[PDB]
Symmetry: D2
């Protein structure tokens, strides 16, 4: 459904980001992968996109925690793609600790990437989409953008802001043919959560995978993880014309996390 | 995208219901419509379905406001298709008036259909899906299942109820291959809506299309109606394996209505 | 605080409702209580209520599930008070049980009491509060009016309904000097809940005071029961002048229940 | 009554913060105000707080936008009041502008003061309350912490961030005797707002009162601004025992803003 569209995905050299660039390409969209890692992989990964889906893939490095760098990013990203229809702010970092102790430097880091990066990101993007008369800004928030969890102050503060920011963007460009929504995922066994499948498994020491099928049991009623492909799928739906009038809202995939 | 699957939509003889079945059929699925009207209009709609999408289309009458009648409906609808994977409880009605002047028979009439029917249609269908190991319950609430408007008590109550019933249904069958979600549409220009557009037309004694754009410019920030066709597309998505972990939540297609 | 103010509280011969009336009286209001029980016990509460707080207290039996009786109730209750400034629709019932197995009668009754009863009582009251230019309609919903939970479909539904209905009331009478909010309590150790604690203690075969701690843990993080006197104090406050602008919202007292 | 207890209110030299401190004092609590302004107007309000409520009112200058400054502030404040029982993080600023034109400097300033400040404030304040076993943290978010309005990206994002932070604060200190809640008020006629009123006045060609009516008209059903005094009443209620079990939730006084 997305043939001929130009999309950009932040933090997409791995995890949920990569799975998304994956599905958008499959939908027939040219994509601008972004993130960190061994140049080799990133290339094998970008290279592999044009192979599976027959679209054009481009890689641009950018530490999206820096406002200007981020803004200069999308601009170059757009230059490479020769346009900019779909922007998906996905890059993000997680840190655990009770407030009174949360490192001050970590707090600023999460806010700067998990939230601020979304704003500047959008800022630069909008003029282009506005000019065109069509656009899909897809912010990747999380359950923790609607509800809260212990010792994740910074992460929850950030995501809650992302969701809120999403609304503003939606209303501000209402009817313009442009939409902004925020996918709010649950438990996705990636490195960001694998660090918590082993942390919760050292305070009990019990099986490393028992601390997982347990990790879920406490938050996700489905007792099953949410696969990145599925998220990429949701990003594809948001980009369809079926969603022309779905703006400023949140789309949750959390095995029933928010239902209770 | 749904080849083989069997679907059912209450109140699908016209309006949003009909559009729902149409996209489910278009996606390759046998559907069972239902509703009121001139058998002539119903038969053409039922047949146009088998003709345009090359699938089996069954018609079943039932005054879903009747308990055993609706529960019976479900089973008889399961024999018609020879199984039952998707259920779209979309039947519903309306009445405008201030709380202290809302006929008690209207209050009832609404709660019976708009809320109770979803309950009876579910309980009847659940045992079936539970045995198949797969299932989809799509309840068509509204924006009035999240926020409220004047002189629509009954309707706002039942929707707020369908949303909460949706939540419960999702939790009781988590990880069983069955998901339950609520589509909370915004203004869709149907007859149920055309009735209020005309009431505004006369109240302010203004144009009929001038009274339309007004109804929008009050709740729908996009100033654009939500096409039934899109809602049928959002229903198709809730059926895709992409939404296997999307359960017990609402899917707002409202042009910004709940963003503010 | 409320010296002189004339209040009414459905289902107050016991538990939460009795508390709601107790703080109301304690705050200087004349109160009308109602509900089932032994005419002896009922007289005692009404009795104590009078001489302990120095205000008039009346009783009025009426089965609130009877739409017609309940309306005659407020008018009747209004006559004894010679006014009606505050209305608290508190009465309600529970019934644990899956969906495919929820007795249609158990659903009908909870819907008739927990939801419909609120509507009628409000319709029968608004008129009075409207003419005087001051009113307080305090609805007792529940966290389950905000989020769902297994085997409690009828309850969770009706509760969402109340929150939704509450909003409509507030909007229809906004500015008139009448406010409408919904108190949403967490676990309150009352007969209604003890009954569930006695089931968990039965199912798991553990100590009763233990099952109580286990009940709390699951949904209520504070691990401390919400107290009646508390919900009472909250109801009082909603009647203060600070609340004057607080209308059509939910006041949640659940020890974190809905925060996660 | 809060006699004995000690309280702190950021940004209280005027506006909502000032009315907040006046109510806690009237309740009998010794308070510490903070903010900017003319040392005479500051020292004036400070005096009235003692000469009118018979309590101790200390003053402390500090640019809450600075992480360390706010962390020492609560430090000195505690040492000043000889303790810290109630923290009211109120300090905040606004700036209207559409995402694409919203000043980067203007953004980071709003985030540092409308979100981060709440963080550090809470970070230094907790240790004290934790050791005491009792505490109250009152965050002054806004209706824009639940919903969104155009051209307020920074502000909306920050508020949600707060409503978000509020939850983690509560959860983390759940059952400890310390609660965290957020007051999300609607339009409160203050400078911050008179500025938005004078923008609609000179940008539409009409009275400064013609615009006010509109300001409310659009978002506030009650068509009446919320009074800074009422907010204080809320804050007082939150510090009461009636609210011992009310934690991690928002307390909205918007006049129906969020009900629709
Ligand atoms: N893992 C989960 O359960 C889960 C749940 C909900 C939401 N999310 C979100 O999904 C998105 C990706 O998280 P993840 O799980 O994939 O973690 P990840 O570790 O798997 O991915 C982080 C991605 O961001 C890149 N990144 C590194 N530095 C960056 C920078 N300065 N700017 C931008 N990107 C940078 C990484 O190299 C990587 O590609 C995030 O914003 C996170 O909110 C994850
Ligand atoms: N129009 C909107 O803006 C809008 C917005 C939100 C939700 N909805 C919902 O969409 C669904 C359809 O509403 P609509 O706009 O299509 O109105 P409609 O008038 O267009 O459709 C009502 C459908 O129900 C059928 N119906 C008649 N009697 C019935 C009965 N006894 N039992 C079951 N169905 C019966 C009708 O024949 C028709 O097919 C509803 O539940 C309504 O909540 C509509
Ligand atoms: N216990 C909790 O944790 C909890 C939590 C949230 C909400 N609530 C609500 O508090 C309200 C009171 O519940 P409860 O815990 O006090 O149960 P309860 O058993 O303690 O009280 C029920 C009250 O309703 C009366 N009642 C009996 N038949 C009635 C009828 N036909 N019509 C009206 N009232 C009738 C009862 O005699 C009693 O006074 C309810 O609507 C329930 O939703 C309770
Ligand atoms: N006015 C409204 O309608 C309204 C509505 C919702 C929320 N609020 C909130 O009320 C709180 C106060 O807003 P306001 O309306 O009173 O604006 P205000 O202009 O009236 O008050 C701003 C307060 O912050 C102080 N301030 C100055 N520099 C500061 C600094 N560096 N750090 C901290 N504080 C500083 C000011 O001196 C003043 O006391 C805010 O966080 C704002 O969210 C106001
Ligand atoms: Ca929740
Ligand atoms: Ca709203
Ligand atoms: Cl947690
Ligand atoms: Cl309205
Ligand atoms: Cl707006």
């Amino acid at each position: 459904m997305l043939k001929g569209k130009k999309a950009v995905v932040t933090g997409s050299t791995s995890g949920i980001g990569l799975a998304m660039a994956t599905e958008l390409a499959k939908a027939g969209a040219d994509v601008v992968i972004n993130g960190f890692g061994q140049p080799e992989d990133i290339e094998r990964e970008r290279s592999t996109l044009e192979s599976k889906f027959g679209v054009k893939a481009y890689y641009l490095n950018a530490d999206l925690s820096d406002a200007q760098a981020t803004r200069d990013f999308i601009a170059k990203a757009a230059e490479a793609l020769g346009g900019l229809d779909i922007l998906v702010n996905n890059a993000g970092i997680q840190h655990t600790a009770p407030i009174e102790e949360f490192p001050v430097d970590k707090w600023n880091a999460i806010i700067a990437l998990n939230l601020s990066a979304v704003f500047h990101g959008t800022a630069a993007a909008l003029p282009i989409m506005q000019k065109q008369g069509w656009g899909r800004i897809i912010n990747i928030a999380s359950a923790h953008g609607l509800v809260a969890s212990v010792n994740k102050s910074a992460y929850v503060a950030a995501k809650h802001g992302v969701v809120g920011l999403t609304k503003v963007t939606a209303l501000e460009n209402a009817g313009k043919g442009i939409t902004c929504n925020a996918i709010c995922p649950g438990w996705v066994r990636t490195p960001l959560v694998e660090k918590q499948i082993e942390a919760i498994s050292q305070q009990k020491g019990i099986d490393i995978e028992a601390a997982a099928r347990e990790l879920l049991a406490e938050k996700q009623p489905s007792l099953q993880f949410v696969t990145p492909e599925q998220l990429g799928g949701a990003a594809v739906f948001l980009s369809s014309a079926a969603a022309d009038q779905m703006t400023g809202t949140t789309l949750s995939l959390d095995g029933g996390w928010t239902a209770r």
